[model samples]
Each structure stands twice: as structure tokens, then as C-alpha cells.
Target: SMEQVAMELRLTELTRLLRSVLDQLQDKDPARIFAQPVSLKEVPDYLDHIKHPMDFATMRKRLEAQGYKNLHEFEEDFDLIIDNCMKYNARDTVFYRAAVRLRDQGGVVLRQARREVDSIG
Candidate 1:
């Protein structure tokens, strides 16, 4: 159904974003990376609440335009974006922290979806 497809698409993006954030957090603070708590049920709505910059949205869309066939492929571009943020906008610590938490929640959703997909096939 369309609802399932939409959920899958959102999950794909959210999972990629979360994984990217976790990678960044690991590099920044390896000792207590996953210490902070994040709400799983609220994250997808949280993403919708945040006001993303036009440039960031453009960059994300551009990366998506490349026709990603899987989550791993999309992850690379997200990694690049986070890397750029770390290198150039290190002052955005708040954003990074929020992203990490968001990623935390995303990881759970991603894993659940993966299991569902696996079971289907």
C-alpha cells in the first residue's frame, strides 16, 4: 500500500540520517557516544518539526537525485554532509547533539523495518 511505501521512504531517509549522526558522534566523543537519551516515538515527527535550511535541503535533494538503490548508498552522501559540518561548522555543536539523538531513535526504527522486510522475503 501507499502508506507502507511512504513509511519505508521516510524510514530510509531517517535511518541514513541517524547512521550519519552516530558516525559523527563516535568520532567526536567515543567514550560516551550513546549516553544521551532520545525519544523513538517522537523522532519522525521531530524531523518534520525542525526548520531545515534551504541549502541543506538542496544538498540532500541533490544527493538523493543520484538515484540511491539502497540505504548504504544514501549513507555515503549523509556521511559527507556530516563530515562537512564537522570540518566547517564545528560551532554547531547543538545541531550535532540533536542529530545524534535523532539518529539513536532512527536506528531502532531502521532495525525494525529491516526485520520486517527480511521476514517478508
Candidate 2:
């Protein structure tokens, strides 16, 4: 239970960080943009792993290469970068989506647990 709660909290933090990165990626220059916490290579990994989109993929790959193993690892590292790019342009849609998914999963787990508990009678 604690582990699940910890993971949810971590995801919440990640959602906030992703919002910040998205904002920075919205810069007009498009060249010197996304120059904050997230590395240029980390973006595509998030897009591919999270199935984000072209905008996120394109913006992420515009920076220096980091030689990461896979898109998943890249996303994990990208999560490390907080408060990247900017703040104004970033949206919380992604976070809300992720949070809602987690909530639904939790509800399912609770229902299953209830079924098991009922059977014990």
C-alpha cells in the first residue's frame, strides 16, 4: 500500500515537471528552446514511451545526444529534470490524464479486494 502511494506521489511530481517542460518547449525560437532541465535527447523518449505525439517528439530530439539505452530510460531521466523550459505554456492535461488512470486502477483494485473479503464470510 505504501509503495503504491509513493508511486502515485512520484507520478504527481513527474506530471508537474512535464508541464514545465512543455511550457519551455513552446518557445518561439524553436531552435534554442527546450534548453532547460530536460536534455534534447530526452524528449523523444517520452513521446515514444508515453505515446505523446510529434510535437513532444520533435521538440525533445532537438538537443544534444545523451546515448541513453532506450526511450523508457530517457523518460526516467527526463523526469529527473524539473522546472525545465518554462511555465506559462505548459498544461496539466497530461498529468490529469495520468492521475485519472491511476485512480481508476486503484478503484479496480479496491473492488477486487472487496470481492475477496466478501468471500471470507
Candidate 3:
């Protein structure tokens, strides 16, 4: 049927796209290894409602001193920062919440990308 054929085609395209991204993700590692994936298992009660002021200028200065050229360059440390914030209920300001979401979302995408790639093969 036409519907069946269309479904098959869509699956094929999805598979191709998944493979392409997976290949790119693997390109950097000659050992074919990536950092152990990280995720938060539960929402902390403290994060539900709190306020912590963050010094943007100070943070920027620190980041700049480290010579980070892009936000992605910060992820390795940002992941740990997010984990600590939740661990200690550091979520207080708008910036912290936004940072948490940004870090987690990026992880989710990368994790899913790896998962799909593994499943396909």
C-alpha cells in the first residue's frame, strides 16, 4: 500500500539522519568512547522554589580567564555545576534555572542521539 511505502521511506530517512549525527558524534574519539553520560534522576525539592543571586560579570570574568571561546566549551564544567546546584539546592535566581535547563537539555539530546545510533545498528 501507499501508506506502507511512505512509512518505510520515512523510517529510512530517519535512520540515515540518525547515522549521520552518530558518525559526527563519534568522529573525535579514536577509541570510540564518549564521556560517561550524566543525568539527574529526580527534581530536588529545593529547586522547586528558591532564589540565589549570581554575579554575571564575575562569572564571565572567570570564564574569560579560562579562555573559553564558546558556551559549549563550558559544558564539561557546567554539567558539574548544575549537579552541585541541585545537590545543595542552589537554585534561586532566574539565571541558575536557565543554566540548569540548558545543561540538561543538551545532555538529553546527546544521550538520545547515542541511544538511537546504538539501536539502529
Top TM-score: which candidate number?
1
lDDT of 1 by residue, 59-119 (tens): 3454445344455654454444344334333355755564455456555654654554344
Worst 10 contiguous positions by lDDT, candidate 3: 30-39
The TM-score of candidate 2 is 0.28
Q: Candidate 2's residue-wise lDDT over 11-113, tens digit each?
A: 5544444444444434422443224333438544443333322234443553223233223443443333322222222456543343344334534443443
The predicted structure with the larger lDDT, 1 or 2, is 1
Candidate maximizing lDDT: 1
Looking at model 2, residue 117 earns an lDDT score of 26
Candidate 2, superposed: residue stretches over 4 Å from native: 28-53, 56-121
TM, every model: 0.35, 0.28, 0.29
For residue 88, what is the lDDT in candidate 1?
A: 30
Candidate 3 residues lying further than 4 Å off, grouped into runs, are 33-121
